[PDB]
Each structure stands twice: as structure tokens, then as C-alpha cells.
Paper text:
So-called major pilins polymerize head-to-tail into the pilus backbone, with ancillary pilins added at the tip (adhesin) and base (anchor).
In the hexagonal crystal structure of GG-SpaD, the N-domain is angled about 100° from the M- and C-domains. Contrastingly in GG-SpaDO, the N-domain is nearly perpendicular to the two other domains and situated midway along the M-domain. Due to this repositioning, the overall length of the GG-SpaD pilin is shortened to 90 Å and the total surface area is reduced to 19,679 Å2. The crystal packing of the open conformation revealed that the single GG-SpaD molecule in the asymmetric unit lacks a linear pilus-like structure. Since this offers a unique structural perspective to backbone pilins, we suggest that the open conformation represents an intermediary snapshot of the backbone pilin during its sortase-mediated assembly into the SpaFED pilus.
Numbering used by the authors: 37 to 47, 66 to 164, 171 to 226, 233 to 481
């Protein structure tokens, strides 16, 4: 009825600061057991854990590694609804410069009370390193605004025997993609190994494709992505010679992506990097999730539920002492539902974008692409026939959603 898990994060060197989260996936596992083997289930959850769990669940117990790189999870249940429990583990945030461990899983009993796990790192790794050229923390979930330039790094090892004849290696694929929309591929910014950029040597010598290319949609299904084959370009030989002199070393592929107006809230969007040396064998990792914010209002005649169009608003934010006001690009000829390509901020309120209500029934002013935190909707004009009731409506964009509810705002009829 009771078990313990002692996690040991080490990378020779122990690692303090790494936070782990435990997930009970007992019933998620036994669901797959109907269609699948124990091994196929065990791996499926380990591979794509976020498919089976909310990875940022508050209730999922979380602990941080101490000085010794050690993290206890005391007193777990052995059973779970008449099944021997199966628990999954996930490194939620990692300190610099360390990498994110693989998402390991265990099925009970094995019996053993004090169970010591040692979460090793994945053979492919992905991170969100920067947002608008400013470094962020390595964590499983990042909240984003529309028009943000996101910088990703996919890291993987070169085989020790890369220059073998048997040539042995004629393919070094690197495939990144997202299943759901939200990003557009901006650019490949570097390919570094041994802290030295080899992108200039490789350009015009690899195969390289992305979402922006006409050849992508016929060959790949996905809205965002890029494919990169080192040994499948116009000069595979020279590119193999280049890689052999860094045989064993860790290549990092950096690229930028732009958050677009198809990115919607209530939708966490991950990416997946796949590395393959042949069509037979792939090593693969899922990056961190990203989500954006939004909010809905209902402008109405006081007392009734009468929707009032052409009530003008500006969105206000605090920057410590400083008031700032939203400037929405890509919203020429929109009203009610605003789906901007970039929300940027100004201290001059005369320059701020005037948001006008539509007169739709359910909610007649929506904004997407917002960061979470506190805001204030300021009514600059009531529609003709109505005076303003309360000039400011302060609210909170909840992290990754449309909010807990649509915010009703009343106008007073003059007659």
C-alpha cells in the first residue's frame, strides 16, 4: 500500500535546482494495455507523456533536487483502483547550463519499497532558449504574446563512427515540427559544434526545407516545421568530412520562429524533434509547450442583456510605476474579435489602438495573443444613446486561457 521514490539527478557532477513532477498514470497505462503490449505502452507514455497528462498540473506533486542532486517522493500509493499503480516522472524546470532529463516511467510492484531512480538525459534534446533575443529559463511551459520571436535549440550527438565505409552513414536527418498552428518559421540562426558556427560551411551543401517552402506541404503534413539532411544535399562528401572531425561531439541547431495570429489560447502547443540516420531508426524528443492568453467582454445596456456595438476601448497595462497602452498590428478593419499579428506597448495613450465592440450576443469584444498578468480595459467612448458607467474595468488574463469568464461591462442609457 506504500512506496517511495528517490530521484538522483547527476550530470560525475550532482545537480541542485532541477524540479521534478510525479504523475499517476495507472489508468492511462491500463487503457493502452487493451490495444498494446506492456513494453509498447511503457514507451508510448515515456515518449509523449503530455499526450496522457497535463504536464503543468498543480496537484501533481513536485520536488526540487538538493545539494546532492537528490529528490525524494515519500509515501506513494501501491494500488490505484485495484491496479498496481504506475507512476511517470518529468523534469519541469532545469538550471543552467544543464539539459532536460528523459521522462521516465515505472510500473509496480517490482517487492521494493525504497525505489531509487536515476533520470538520465535524452539523446536528442530541445529547448526554448530566448524570446525576442532575451534569454529565458529552461522550463516545460512558456507563455507567449503574438508577434514574439522565439529562439529554439535542438541538440544531438554526432556518431563516433560517422566517417565509416562498411559509406556507412548516408543520411543524417533532423526533423522538427508542430502538429497545431501558432508559429511560422522565421530562420535557421546557427549550427554550432564545439562552440563554433559551422552554418556557413554547410549552407548550399545540406538539404534544408521548412514550412515556408512550396515543397513542404506536399511532402509533410505539418503547419510548422523544418527538415534538414546533412548527407542529403549537393555535397554530402564534404559535409561528412566536416562532421567526422567532430565525431562524438554534440551539434546544436538554433532556429527562430514567430508567434502568429493563428496561435489561440486554451491550447498548449508543443514541438517534436526527430533525428534519424536511416528510415529504420529514429531518436526523438518533444520540446517545451507554449500557450498564449486572451479575454472576452460583453458590453451591454445596464440591467438588460442588450449588446452595444461601437463602444470604444483601449487596453491598459502597468510596468511598475508606468501606465502602458496596447498597439495592435494586423487589425485594420476588425471589430469585436481582434486577432492581431503583434501587440506592442506605448506610454502615449493617443497612439494606442481603439478597440470597438461588435454587437454580438455572447461576447462582443475578444482579444487574443496576450501575456498573462493584470490589465485594465479603459472605455474611451460609449456608443450614442449611452453614457459610460465605470470608466475602467481591471481584469486578469489567466495563464493560457480565455479567462475564468467573459467580463460583463455595463453602459447607462441617457433617456
Amino acid at each position: 500500500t506504500t512506496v517511495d521514490f528517490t530521484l538522483h539527478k547527476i550530470e560525475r557532477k550532482p545537480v541542485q535546482g532541477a524540479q521534478f513532477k510525479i504523475f499517476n498514470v495507472t489508468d492511462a497505462f491500463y487503457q493502452l494495455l487493451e490495444n498494446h503490449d506492456k513494453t509498447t505502452a511503457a514507451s508510448m507514455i515515456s515518449q509523449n507523456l503530455g499526450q496522457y497528462v497535463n504536464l503543468q498540473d498543480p496537484n501533481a506533486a513536485t520536488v526540487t533536487t538538493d545539494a546532492d542532486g537528490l529528490a525524494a517522493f515519500k509515501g506513494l500509493a501501491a494500488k490505484t483502483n485495484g491496479r498496481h499503480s504506475v507512476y511517470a516522472f518529468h523534469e519541469a524546470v532545469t538550471p543552467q547550463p544543464y539539459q532536460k532529463a528523459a521522462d521516465m516511467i515505472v510500473s509496480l510492484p517490482v517487492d521494493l519499497t525504497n525505489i531509487h531512480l536515476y533520470p538520465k538525459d535524452s539523446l536528442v534534446t530541445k529547448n526554448l532558449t530566448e524570446i525576442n533575443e532575451q534569454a529565458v529559463a529552461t522550463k516545460d511551459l512558456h507563455d507567449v504574446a503574438v508577434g514574439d520571436v522565439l529562439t529554439y535549440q535542438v541538440q544531438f550527438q554526432i556518431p563516433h563512427d560517422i566517417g565509416a565505409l562498411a559509406f556507412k552513414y548516408n543520411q543524417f536527418k533532423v526533423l522538427d515540427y508542430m502538429t497545431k498552428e501558432g508559429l511560422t518559421f522565421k530562420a535557421l540562426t546557427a549550427i554550432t559544434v564545439d562552440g563554433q558556427d559551422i552554418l556557413k560551411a554547410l549552407t548550399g551543401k545540406m538539404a534544408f526545407m521548412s514550412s515556408n517552402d512550396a515543397a513542404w506541404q506536399q511532402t509533410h503534413n505539418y503547419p510548422f516545421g523544418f527538415e534538414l539532411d546533412f548527407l542529403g544535399g549537393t555535397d554530402p562528401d564534404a559535409v561528412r568530412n566536416l562532421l567526422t572531425q567532430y565525431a562524438g561531439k554534440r551539434v546544436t541547431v538554433a532556429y527562430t520562429g514567430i508567434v502568429n495570429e493563428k496561435m489561440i489560447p486554451d491550447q498548449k502547443v508543443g514541438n517534436t524533434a526527430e533525428v534519424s540516420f536511416d528510415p529504420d531508426s529514429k531518436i526523438t524528443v518533444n520540446g517545451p509547450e507554449i500557450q498564449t492568453g486572451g479575454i472576452r467582454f460583453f458590453k451591454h445596456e445596464a440591467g438588460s442583456s442588450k449588446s452595444l456595438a461601437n463602444a470604444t476601448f483601449i487596453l491598459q497595462r502597468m510596468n511598475g510605476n508606468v501606465r502602458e497602452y496596447a498597439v495592435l498590428e494586423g487589425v485594420n478593419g476588425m471589430a469585436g474579435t481582434y486577432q492581431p499579428t503583434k501587440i506592442t506597448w506605448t506610454t502615449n495613450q493617443d497612439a494606442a489602438t481603439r478597440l470597438k465592440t461588435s454587437g454580438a450576443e455572447t461576447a462582443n469584444l475578444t482579444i487574443q495573443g496576450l501575456l498573462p498578468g493584470r490589465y485594465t480595459l479603459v472605455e474611451t467612448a460609449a456608443p450614442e444613446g449611452y453614457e459610460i458607467l465605470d470608466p475602467t474595468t481591471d481584469f486578469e488574463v489567466i495563464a493560457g486561457t480565455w479567462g475564468t469568464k467573459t467580463i460583463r461591462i455595463a453602459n447607462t442609457p441617457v433617456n
